[PDB]
Each structure stands twice: as C-alpha cells, then as structure tokens.
Symmetry: C2
Amino acid sequence: SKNVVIYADGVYDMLHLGHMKQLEQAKKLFENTTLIVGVTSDNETKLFKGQVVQTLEERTETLKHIRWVDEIISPCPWVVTPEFLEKYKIDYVAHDDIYAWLKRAGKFKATQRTEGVSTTDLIVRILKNYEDY
Amino acid sequence: SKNVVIYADGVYDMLHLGHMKQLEQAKKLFENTTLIVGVTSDNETKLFKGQVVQTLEERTETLKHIRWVDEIISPCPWVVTPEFLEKYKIDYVAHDDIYAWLKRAGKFKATQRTEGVSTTDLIVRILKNYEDY
C-alpha cells in the first residue's frame, strides 16, 4: 500500500518507555508510513505546559535513536495548523475542542499513553528503598 | 562489504543517551553489521556489580525501541566465553585483564562511554532548582 505520512508531537523530556510505545503506535497506524515527530520548544513548553529538564537539543538528540522516528521537526509549532499539515504533506496527526478541525478533516488518529512507566516513576522506585522510619 | 556480527552487553538500566551513543558506535564499527545486545540478569548484576532499578524484562523492552539494536540476548551471560561467540557467530565484541583473550583473538573493539548524560544526571539537574538556603 502507498505511504502515509503521520505526525506526532510532544515534549519528550526524559524519554521513557511510554514515549517509545506511543511513537511505535503512531508509526504502525498504517502498513507503510513515514513518522514525523515534532519536539516542542523550551520557551513554549515552559510557558504553556510546565517544567522541562532537558533542552530542545537534548530531547531531540535522544529521539533520533528511536527506531520508529523517521523525521523530526525541532522545534515544532506549539499549535498544529492546516497550513502546517499542507507544508509537510502530513496525512494524519497521531494524538492522545481545539482539535475539532483535525477530526472534521479525518486527520485525527488516537494513540494511547502508558501509565506507570515514566522516568520519574523509576526514581520513585529508587526512593522506596529508604524507609520512612 | 559482507556482514559483520557485533556483540555488546551491559545493564541498560534507566536507558539514556550515553547508552544510545555507545550502541550506535558498536553498530557502526563496520559498514554492514548485525548488532546483538546482551542484557545482564537482575541477580548477577546486583550480586557482582551494583544496584539496578528496572527488571531484566523492563530493561530489555526499552532496548527494543533503539534503532541500532538488531538482536537482543536477554538475559545474557555475565562472562563472555569463546564458546558463546561461536554459538551466536559473533565476529567482534564492542567493549569499553579478563578480556585479554578477546584482544588476542582480534575480537575486541573499543567503544566509549559518554559522561554527564545519564538519567541520574537529569534528576540531579532537577534537584538543583531547590537551593540549600
């Protein structure tokens, strides 16, 4: 079948198994895809969403090692627009109502977040070795 | 050129950019390779080396997402033997003197560890936002 261009975006701070599973899901939405991943800017993530420990360049450099990632847009726009999809020839956005327009266009494909597999979850596990009393 | 089988092993706890760079280096030791990665057992790592937060299965599942990894042996032997190299048809071991035999055989290829890019380094960076006073 013909190639389908998928776009996913996010912060990808402290990249962990949950990110990797969500990227794998986006990559496998169709038989033959190109997965483009957008990595949000330091300034916009911190201003609009919350704290980020790794820089844009760090988050992007780690992402390049993930086998599902075919292209990276770094930094990506904070808000996806139809003009953006046209510019990068994106067929679908893989996403976990400001997104109504994507759904009306047939370009919204749901992906899932995995709970309990994050990097901070691992640190909590480390800390549990130290009893309160 | 003909395909070269490379073996690298380690713990791969809290997989981070330094692991990924070392795996990339092993994968690119030759033009055409198969990179086999051995993931050490929970019991042997803890007994012989030190603490590990993720299980064998967790460490292995994260590794499968790394684009340089062609095959995983999970768990791998704690000590590499010549019989192991023969069994898996391994041409070179990518490694960062119990290893003298590998060097005498021409099967030792050095790789480098990157400093300051680990997962715990990221947590230290988080903690620095909280001043002592």
